[PDB]
Structures are given as C-alpha cells and as structure tokens.
Design a protein around this ligand. Structure first.
Ligand SMILES: [Mg+2]
Ligand SMILES: [Mg+2]
Ligand SMILES: [Mg+2]
Ligand SMILES: [Mg+2]
Ligand SMILES: [Mg+2]
Ligand SMILES: [Mg+2]
Ligand SMILES: [Mg+2]
Ligand SMILES: [Mg+2]
Ligand SMILES: [Mg+2]
Ligand SMILES: [Mg+2]
Ligand SMILES: [Mg+2]
Ligand SMILES: [Mg+2]
Ligand SMILES: [Mg+2]
Ligand SMILES: [Mg+2]
Ligand SMILES: [Mg+2]
Ligand SMILES: [Mg+2]
Ligand SMILES: [Mg+2]
Ligand SMILES: [Mg+2]
Ligand SMILES: [Mg+2]
Ligand SMILES: [Mg+2]
Ligand SMILES: [Mg+2]
Ligand SMILES: [Mg+2]
Ligand SMILES: [Mg+2]
Ligand SMILES: [Mg+2]
Ligand SMILES: [Mg+2]
Ligand SMILES: [Mg+2]
Ligand SMILES: [Mg+2]
Ligand SMILES: [Mg+2]
Ligand SMILES: [Mg+2]
Ligand SMILES: [Mg+2]
Ligand SMILES: [Mg+2]
Ligand SMILES: [Mg+2]
Ligand SMILES: [Mg+2]
Ligand SMILES: [Mg+2]
Ligand SMILES: [Mg+2]
Lengths: 99, 126, 100, 151, 208, 82
RNA sequence: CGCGAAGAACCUUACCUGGUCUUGACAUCCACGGAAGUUUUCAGAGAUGAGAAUGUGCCUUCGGGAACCGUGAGACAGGUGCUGCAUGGCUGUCGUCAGCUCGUGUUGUGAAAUGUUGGGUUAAGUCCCGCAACGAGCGCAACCCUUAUCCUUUGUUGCCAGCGGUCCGGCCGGGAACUCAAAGGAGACUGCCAGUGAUAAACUGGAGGAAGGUGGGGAUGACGUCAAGUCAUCAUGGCCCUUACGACCAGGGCUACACACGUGCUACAAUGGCGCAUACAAAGAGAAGCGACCUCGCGAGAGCAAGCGGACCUCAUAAAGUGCGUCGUAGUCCGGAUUGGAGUCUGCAACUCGACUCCAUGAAGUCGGAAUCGCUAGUAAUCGUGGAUCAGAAUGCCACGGUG
C-alpha cells in the first residue's frame, strides 16, 4: 500500500487538500482508507514584551502542526500517476511512502 | 448479553462491563484486593454496588488506564453508576438522590505567569 | 549590537566551517583507544595550532536582524522583541497568540 | 467574605466504621495531603484506646470528646475607646471543630515514641479529665466567667 | 503601552496571515530571513508606489510574491519592464524561481496603510497636521467606512514638549473580536524627530 | 581535572621554547603569557614569569609544583584588607 | 533587588593592563596594478609580517567593465559615548477597579451643571421604573482558545467487547463495538413550576440535566496619571570624538569580602532515616540530534552499532505511596555544610572559575525575636517529570500531572 502524510497549519486548508486527493483516487480507481486524524503537536513559545525590565509581563504563542494520513490500497498505473500529477496549495506538505 | 459503562474522573477513563452472576471483580486481570492499597479505595470502588442491593447478582469486568490511585477509583464509581442505568433505569432516581451520577468537573488548574504555583504569589517587601 | 560584532561573526563562521575536515581527524586520533600513544601526543599539539577562532564553540547566536546577543530563540532565528513585532503583524505563519 | 453567604461543604465518610464524625478527625491529623498514614495512625490508636478503656471502638471517642467541647468563649470588639472581650456562645459545628483541634494540638507535644501512642494517651487522659486538652478547655471556659460583666 | 496590536489578536478569528508557507524546524529559521529580505527591498523600491500589503507564499520551493498596490501602472509602465525586471532579483534573493503578481486596491482612502502613509508624507512636507488628520477622517468617512480613529504622537507642530492627539468618528470597538479592524502605523522622520502615526479603520462586523 | 587519556596540556610555544631554553641553560627569566600549562618534570629548576593580569610575576619552579598549572603561583587580584 | 542576563572559563564584553592599525574591522564610488587559489617554512603570546605549489565559466572597437582581490589620495564610514526632561515604538502601575466623555436642547451674567442624580437591583454607568432631558461613542457583557456529558463521520504506528489459533506478550488471523486521536454539530437561556415583590427589573428555594444562574480557568487592561522605565534591542533631532570615545589580539575582570537587606532551596526528624520487593500518571523534545540491546567499570561513563523527521524509535525508571524488616529520642544510622586523596565528560583550554560519581571528613542547627507573607476547592500544603537559552553549566523561569 501507499501512504501519504499531510502536514499543515490550518484545518480549513488541510481538508480541501485532502478531499482533492480522495476525489482523485476515487476518480482514477478506488480503495483509499480515508483520512485518519493523527496527533497535533503544539509547539508553545513564551517571550517577554517589555524592552528593559519587567519579568512579570509575557506573551504566549503556539503553533499547532496539523497531521493527516491517507492510505491507498490497490494502485493501477493511472492511480499512481494521477496523484503525482497533483500539486497542492502552499501550507501543506506531503511525503509519499510505499509501505 | 452484557451491559456497558464509561466513566471519567480527574485524568482516568474506566471501562466497565456488567453480567448477571455471583460477584466477581476483575480489574486489568487482577482481583480487587491485588490492585488497590487503601480500604477507602476499596470502599469507593464498591460503593454503588452496596447502595442498590446488587452485590450478589452480578459480575463485572473493568479496565482502567491512566490517572492516579483516586482517579482509577472515582472513574470506576462513575463507570458503574453509568452502567447500572442500562440495567433497570428505576435505579436512576436513587443514584441521583445519592449523588453518584454527576461527573466531577474538577481538574488540575494550570500555572500562570509570575505565580510560583497555580495561585501562590512570591513574597513581598517594601 | 555594534556594527563590528556582526562582521566578527561572519568572519568566524567561515573559518569554523572551513576547517571542519581537520577537527574531526584530530579528535578521532585523540579520543580513540587503540591508536599510537606517541601520535596521540602530536595530534594534540596540532589542535592548538589550528587557529583559535576555527571552533564550533566560540560563537553566540546573534540575531538575524538587529544583532542582539541575548534572548535568542533557535526556531525562528530572531530575538525576543523582533519575534513579537512579526508575530503581532502576521509575517510568521501559524503563529497565533496562545491561550488554553 | 463580605457578601456571599456560603455553604459548609460535603465530605466522604470514614473508610472503616461508617461515621461522618471521624471524617474531620482523620483530616486534622494530616500534613502534606498524605491521607493514608492519617487513616492508619488513627485506626491504630482507636484500637489501643478501645482496649485500654474496655469500651467499644466507636464509643471510646465521643465520651472523651465530651470532656473537651467548650460551651462559651470570647471574641474581641472595641466599639468605643476600649477593647472589650465578649463571651459569646459557640455554634454546634465549631464546638466539635474546636474539640478535635485542641486534642491534636496537644498530642504533638508529648514525649513518646509513636503517634499512635501519643494519641491513645491523649484520649485516655481526656477520658479521665486530666491533660493538656482539658486544661486548655479550663482556660477558655474560665475566660467567660472572668468576663460575664461584658455581653 | 496597554493595548494589544489589534491585527495580532485577530490572526485566526478574522484576519488571515501575510505569509502562508510551511517548513519544519530546519528551514523555518532561514525562511524568516528570505522573507524579510524580499519585503525590505520591495518596501524600499516601490516607495513612490501605493503599496499596502506584500503577501509571500511558497508552494514547492518556489516563491509567489503578491503585491497589493493601487497605482499598478506606475508599477508596470511600458510593455513589459518593471515586474519582469523585478523577477530576476527576487529570484536571486530567494534563490528559487520568482513569481510576482499585482493586486489592485480599490478605494485607496480606506486601506489602513495608505492613509497612514498619506499622513506621514504630508508631515514630511510640513502641512498642518490638524488639517491633515481631519482631511483623512473626512475622506475615509464619506467613502463608507463605518468608523475610524487617527492618532498622531510626538513633537507636533515643531513644539518642544511632545504630546499626542487623536480623532474618532463612528465606532471602533477593539474589544469586540470579530470586527474588521484595519490597523497600521508609520513614522515620519522630520527635522525634529520621529512623529508617529497610528490609524484604526472599522469596515464592518464579520461573521464566520 | 582533565580527562587523563588526552594527556596533559602545554602550549607549543612554551614547550619548544622550554626545550630550547634547557639546552641553552640561561637563567635569564623566561616570560610567558600562557598561564594554563601543566608544568613538566624537565621544567624543574627554571625561572619563568607568568602573566597575572597586569605584569609578569616571577616563579622559580621546584620538584613540588610539577602536578599543578602555572596559574596557581600568580595570584590575580590584589588584596590587602578593609 | 533569582530584574534586561532564556543560562560570563576563552568567546559573550561593553571594563583593565600590555602589544599593534589609521579611507580603516564593516559599504557603494573610484585613482588601479593584478583570476580567486586546498596546501605549506621562519619569527611572534597572538594580532601578521616574512615564505613555498598558480590562472582562464564569462568575453570585449582589447585609452575597460562582471561574483571574487592587493596599495595610496580621498567623499563618507565607525561610537555599547552623553540627552528617556527634546522624541517614535514597547511595557509596568492605579485596575480587570466601572468608571471616562462628546453631540444637539434647556437653565446660569460666568467658570460650569443637567444627561451620568433619585427609589429598587446586579459581579458592573447591569437592567427596569421616574425625572429638562433626548440620543449616541470608548468601557462592562457576548463573539474567541481551553476544560466538563452525548451524537455522527475516518480507523494506523492507536484499541480489543464478542470470534479462532496463543509461545498466555493484541502477539496473530481478524473486528469498528469501546477508551482514545480530530473535523462538523447538538447543549444552558434565568428557558421552565412555585413564592416575595412597585403588575416591571430581579431575587430566593426545587424539578429535569453531565454542568445553575458568569458552570471552572485563560485571552482581551477605557480616558488618563507619576516629565514612571530603558538613546544599551532597533530607529532616531541636536551635540561631542576622528593617530580616537574607532578597530584587531593574548592574559586578567565582572565570581574580590570586615558587614547589612531581599528572594529561594535543604534541614532541625518517628506523619520520620536506611535496605529488599511492589503497583498508577501527564505534557513535552530530538539529525552537527535523541542514542535503547550487548560487553568492560564499585560509579560518573568511555566500547560496538541497530532504531527514528517520530501516536512506530529513543530520552524514560515515575516519586509521594502500599508490605516486610532494622532503628529507639541521642547533635542521633538526624543534617549535609566545609576540607583532603583518587577519577569521568563536553571543550583549542576547567589555576583565578564546570557539572558530576566514588572513598574520607560530619560544622552550624532541637521549630526560630519584634514585625511580617501567601491562599477560599482540585485551591494552600508536599511529591516527582519535561522544555526554553545550551558544546559543558541553573535550588531560579516556564509548563504538566500524582496525593489531597
Ligand atoms: Mg521573578
Ligand atoms: Mg522589610
Ligand atoms: Mg520586589
Ligand atoms: Mg556560548
Ligand atoms: Mg474572598
Ligand atoms: Mg499587558
Ligand atoms: Mg571572556
Ligand atoms: Mg519618561
Ligand atoms: Mg518613552
Ligand atoms: Mg535613568
Ligand atoms: Mg530635565
Ligand atoms: Mg452639553
Ligand atoms: Mg439664558
Ligand atoms: Mg461620573
Ligand atoms: Mg457631571
Ligand atoms: Mg442608580
Ligand atoms: Mg452602558
Ligand atoms: Mg469582556
Ligand atoms: Mg433540585
Ligand atoms: Mg438548582
Ligand atoms: Mg526619570
Ligand atoms: Mg546608558
Ligand atoms: Mg544602530
Ligand atoms: Mg578578549
Ligand atoms: Mg554580575
Ligand atoms: Mg540576615
Ligand atoms: Mg526507615
Ligand atoms: Mg535537548
Ligand atoms: Mg558494565
Ligand atoms: Mg546521613
Ligand atoms: Mg566520601
Ligand atoms: Mg549546637
Ligand atoms: Mg527533641
Ligand atoms: Mg543545558
Ligand atoms: Mg500540582
């Protein structure tokens, strides 16, 4: 089988990017295994704000890396080819992985 | 044929299964005394089986994961008090009168900025 | 910082990344086990003659914009204040102000 | 607090016996949240006392707490240009809350070798009307009659 | 300083980001200089232009710089020069095949950077700030923007004791999160100092 | 202490200088701005002068010192008492 | 006053003593000889002089230009040097307190007032009712992130209720139920029954519910004030320097100590030391990186080399607790300070100055004076684990849970 990761920062931009892959596999063939919601790393950061001397005043930011994963079971030639035909919008990373 | 519950205390998730039987208590393939240390934990794990008169009639299978020694006791208490509401359902008014159906919405409260604990200040001079 | 310090850093990184072949072929001979105990004494006298700045310990991470040495963050690359001024405008992606 | 009149909260019952009286008493023996050793010390001394008095284990406690509940005590006013003490009566809850606190404040001042023995002695003494508990009770109970001209 | 920068409290509620790329920790460091080196050169170069907002975007090791501006004919000019000459230097700085766009800013009396840059050019050429602010509030109010606050600060009118001033109109709730608050600042460097300007423009409430 | 299996430390510019200065013998005091060298046994009986922060201080080195480093006979900041 | 400093051995570094340079350490313009070049000796602490093996990617009306390089004249460079009482930007405070004001109208000669007061009520200038007031804006509330129960959808690296093998390890055929991981929704409104109310505003009890009246926390800090705080993050208006207040290098210095104050850690012990067995967590981090298994070492750790851009692999064992011993009120088998001997690791280099482990040493201290500090429920009190800065180096800082 062939598995693809999807990493993004925004879950109104990961879901179109994964529906345009399920509606590519299910338009070149069949046997996709849906999106499976993996864990979500939240890389926090905490900085001071004041330029000289205030240790009791802070801003706290986070970054929430959204994961998804999609399997592909029985690949034809056009099934693997119409996927590498496809690019995606910026913000989303992929990494194709046979097994 | 068996009935099912699911309860959550502080940071635990019990999972309880009820069958009619004699009274066997199994937790993560351990007997009830082998797991728990204190007799108040053996009290609170048993409490709603004592409250209604259903110690003898039923056996139960329990799995619990994650939490503390009180978390995996209150969790099973909430689990059985859910799982007995899928047995006869006129137990519900007396379990509610006893105060066992309410899931405790308490949890550990975070640490803020410039507070050496969740609410403890540092000290003070003039 | 001053206008000389950033020049010193971009003069240090070049040497420290140029001589990276010899300071993993002197520490090998020094910190080996079965090697010569009279070549392990010349491979420790070469290491004080390779020039002093050529060393991946002797450089503090200056800021990528100002030059402020303290208060770094490694992931962004910018200091304590010039991460706040970008993340409260929108130039760093996914960097919303956290609460929970 | 100023505004919100508030409620005295619930408690678990005791593990062993079945009285919600002992729920405060196992709590007042405690330091740093470890309620298990507090549940153990008390259920050792409430057997040693239950042997030394020849009474039942639940009944050797109330008739030694009876001798250390007060009836009246003082607070302080200063309405005019003068501090007054005032002998007020005491509430039915704070009665027991004072009783179970004086005994434990006393039983960390003996010289014995164990907390169980330090509490069995401190309950037998206040079962026979002697000891550092009922002497404190005599001081509190006498500062009413030394101030009954104030009310 | 008591109030949060009212763009960056709405960075996920209404306002979207000004850079949408993605990389992991080993490249997130370098992209925040290959972004700033292509915003700095453009903010230098098209200073005469009406530029408001440069949005960068990296799909598949390739940049895509969108300029928001309101004088697109003084950035393009004759048949084929200015954006296609900018391609070869943006590609050199970013090290990838560059790709530049142009986005027309309709109604340039409302885009909050443009009113700020109008006022900070007027105070370079020494007009009365009390006239300039009221002109800005008038033009941004009759165009249809439901509310505006302008604020100037420091060395106003050549004085030797600094102070601020500010003019409201309409309604500008900064505590209500779901508004369309547009905020930007600027900094005139006159012969007496730096005279700071902040704006605030409320285009309407926005559901979601 | 150092790790032993690297051996002791000494600068080249003092090692080669001291092997020349033994085989030319002169007790003209040898000065150095290298106060981090482990003193070697063939440095027994020499008059060197280590920097201290201001000037050299002279050190006549005997059998007893040969474990230590050249800093521990140059006290650095002056002190007299309040 | 554990504050910039999220981490000073050299570096950082701004300070000191020495050695040195002056269109410069850092840029564009040239005057302009001359492709850059891994290497390599002498002298020097090093700064950097003296010395050894080289050229063609352009390509030229070849009196000259392109990424790279030497020398002298310059125009500017450079300052962590003063002015936060000339400024921008950013923050602390009164204060998360419920207040600060404008537009017409009227009254007052006028500064100003009315609105915003008054009787009720709310956490709140919140809401209703009356009033020379009528209306509106910034605030006080709501929209947002997280926590609390249910319903869908998608089932590996996550899970195992019923199936069959099972090395009794969900491991292995399998299963989509369940915990759980996340997308979209349902949910709480004083909406409902009663009573006091000025018939209203509300408020008090109780019924249903997982949650009751803002369900619990966070995010957001009005007008403004002390000429509050930094020109030393950065930018700056004027001023001062230019064989120096600029710039390179080695070694010192911030870490000294007769003393006083502020913040924290460890204890003064039986609710406790020590030795053996035994269970239950959460949230993070990792490619110059995290580095399991196996062997050598009493121990820090060196040796070999799989696994992982990670719900897969590592760091990783939780400790408090529970059971069985020992201990017997002693400066104690309490407490670990200080000092000597031997070692390990990162690192050009641990002498002034690194953490850590072993063998010795075993101070001061028996609950602490006047005066003072924090906290109203998963809270204070104790227990461990992680992260940021970082080659090595926090008892502080920032996070999450365990008992309660
Ligand atoms: Mg502090
Ligand atoms: Mg004081
Ligand atoms: Mg203070
Ligand atoms: Mg460093
Ligand atoms: Mg209170
Ligand atoms: Mg603030
Ligand atoms: Mg230094
Ligand atoms: Mg000031
Ligand atoms: Mg200021
Ligand atoms: Mg000052
Ligand atoms: Mg002044
Ligand atoms: Mg008026
Ligand atoms: Mg009139
Ligand atoms: Mg008022
Ligand atoms: Mg008024
Ligand atoms: Mg009122
Ligand atoms: Mg209001
Ligand atoms: Mg609010
Ligand atoms: Mg009720
Ligand atoms: Mg109710
Ligand atoms: Mg001042
Ligand atoms: Mg200064
Ligand atoms: Mg500058
Ligand atoms: Mg130096
Ligand atoms: Mg210091
Ligand atoms: Mg003192
Ligand atoms: Mg013991
Ligand atoms: Mg690390
Ligand atoms: Mg071994
Ligand atoms: Mg000891
Ligand atoms: Mg020892
Ligand atoms: Mg003593
Ligand atoms: Mg004693
Ligand atoms: Mg570290
Ligand atoms: Mg805690």
């Amino acid at each position: 089988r062939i598995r693809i990761r999807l990493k993004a920062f925004d879950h109104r931009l990961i879901d179109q990017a994964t529906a345009e892959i399920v509606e590519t596999a299910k338009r070149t063939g069949a046997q996709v295994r849906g999106p499976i919601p993996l864990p979500t790393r939240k890389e926090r950061f905490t900085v001071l704000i004041s330029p000289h001397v205030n240790k009791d005043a802070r801003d706290q930011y986070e970054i929430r890396t959204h994961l998804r994963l999609v399997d592909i079971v029985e690949p034809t030639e056009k099934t693997v080819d119409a996927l590498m035909r496809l690019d995606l919008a910026a913000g989303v990373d992929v990494q194709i992985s046979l097994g | 044929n068996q009935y099912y519950g699911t309860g959550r205390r502080k940071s635990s998730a019990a999972r309880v299964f009820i069958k009619p039987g004699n009274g066997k208590i199994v937790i993560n393939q351990r007997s009830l005394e082998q797991y728990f240390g204190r007799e108040t934990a053996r009290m609170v794990v048993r409490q709603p089986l004592e409250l209604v008169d259903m110690v003898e009639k039923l056996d139960l299978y329990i799995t619990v994961k994650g939490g503390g020694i009180s978390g995996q006791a209150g969790a099973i208490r909430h689990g059985i008090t859910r799982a007995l509401m899928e047995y006869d359902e006129s137990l519900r008014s007396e379990l509610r009168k006893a105060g066992f159906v309410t899931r405790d919405a308490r949890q550990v409260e975070r640490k803020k900025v410039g507070l050496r604990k969740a609410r403890r200040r540092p000290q003070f001079s003039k | 910082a001053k206008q000389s310090m950033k020049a010193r850093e971009v003069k240090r990184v070049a040497l420290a990344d140029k001589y990276f072949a010899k300071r993993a072929e002197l520490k090998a001979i020094i910190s080996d086990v079965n090697a010569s105990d009279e070549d392990r004494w010349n491979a420790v006298l070469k290491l004080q003659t390779l020039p002093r700045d050529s060393s991946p310990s002797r450089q503090r991470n200056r800021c990528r914009q100002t030059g402020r040495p303290h208060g770094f963050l490694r992931k962004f690359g910018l200091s304590r204040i010039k991460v706040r001024e970008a993340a409260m405008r929108g130039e760093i992606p996914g960097l919303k102000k956290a609460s929970w | 607090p100023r505004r919100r009149v508030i409620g005295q909260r619930k408690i678990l019952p005791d593990p062993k016996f079945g009285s919600e009286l002992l729920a405060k008493f196992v709590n007042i023996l405690m330091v740093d949240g470890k309620k298990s050793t507090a549940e153990s010390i008390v259920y050792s001394a409430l057997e040693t006392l239950a042997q030394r008095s020849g009474k039942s284990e639940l009944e050797a406690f109330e008739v030694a707490l009876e001798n250390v509940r007060p009836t009246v005590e003082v607070k302080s006013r200063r309405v005019g240009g003068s501090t007054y003490q005032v002998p007020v009566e005491v509430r039915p809850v704070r009665r027991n809350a004072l009783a179970m606190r004086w005994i434990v404040e006393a039983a960390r001042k003996r010289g014995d070798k164990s907390m169980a023995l330090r509490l069995a002695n401190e309950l037998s003494d206040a079962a026979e009307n002697k000891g550092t508990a009922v002497k404190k009770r005599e001081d509190v109970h006498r500062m009413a009659e030394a101030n009954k001209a104030f009310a | 300083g008591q109030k949060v920068h009212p763009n960056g409290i709405r960075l996920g509620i209404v306002k979207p980001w000004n850079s949408t790329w993605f990389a992991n920790t080993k490249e997130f460091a370098d992209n925040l200089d290959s972004d700033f080196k292509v915003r700095q050169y453009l903010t230098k170069e098209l200073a005469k232009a009406s530029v408001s907002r440069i949005v960068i975007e990296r799909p598949a090791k390739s940049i895509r710089v969108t300029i928001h501006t309101a004088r697109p004919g003084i950035v393009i000019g004759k048949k084929g020069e200015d954006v296609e000459k900018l391609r070869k230097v943006v590609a050199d700085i970013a090290g990838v095949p560059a790709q530049i766009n142009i986005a027309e800013v309709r109604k340039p009396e409302l885009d909050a950077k443009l009113v700020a840059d109008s006022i900070t050019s007027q105070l370079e050429r020494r007009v009365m700030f009390r006239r300039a602010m009221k002109r800005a509030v008038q033009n941004a109010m009759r165009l249809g923007a439901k509310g505006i606050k302008v604020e100037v600060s420091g060395r106003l009118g050549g004085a030797e004791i600094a102070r601020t001033e500010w003019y409201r109109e309409g309604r500008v709730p900064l505590h209500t999160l779901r508004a369309d608050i547009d905020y930007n600042t600027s900094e005139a460097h006159t012969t007496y100092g730096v005279i700071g300007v902040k704006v605030w423009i409320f285009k309407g409430e926005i559901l979601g | 202490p150092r790790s032993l299996k690297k051996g002791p430390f000494i600068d080249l510019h003092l090692l080669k200088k001291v092997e020349k200065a033994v085989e030319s013998g002169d007790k003209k005091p040898l000065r150095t701005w290298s106060r981090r060298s482990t003193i070697f046994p063939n440095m027994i009986g020499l008059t060197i002068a280590v920097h201290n922060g201001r000037q050299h201080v002279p050190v006549f080195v005997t059998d007893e010192m040969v474990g230590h480093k050249l800093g521990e006979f140059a006290p650095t900041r002056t002190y007299r008492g309040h």
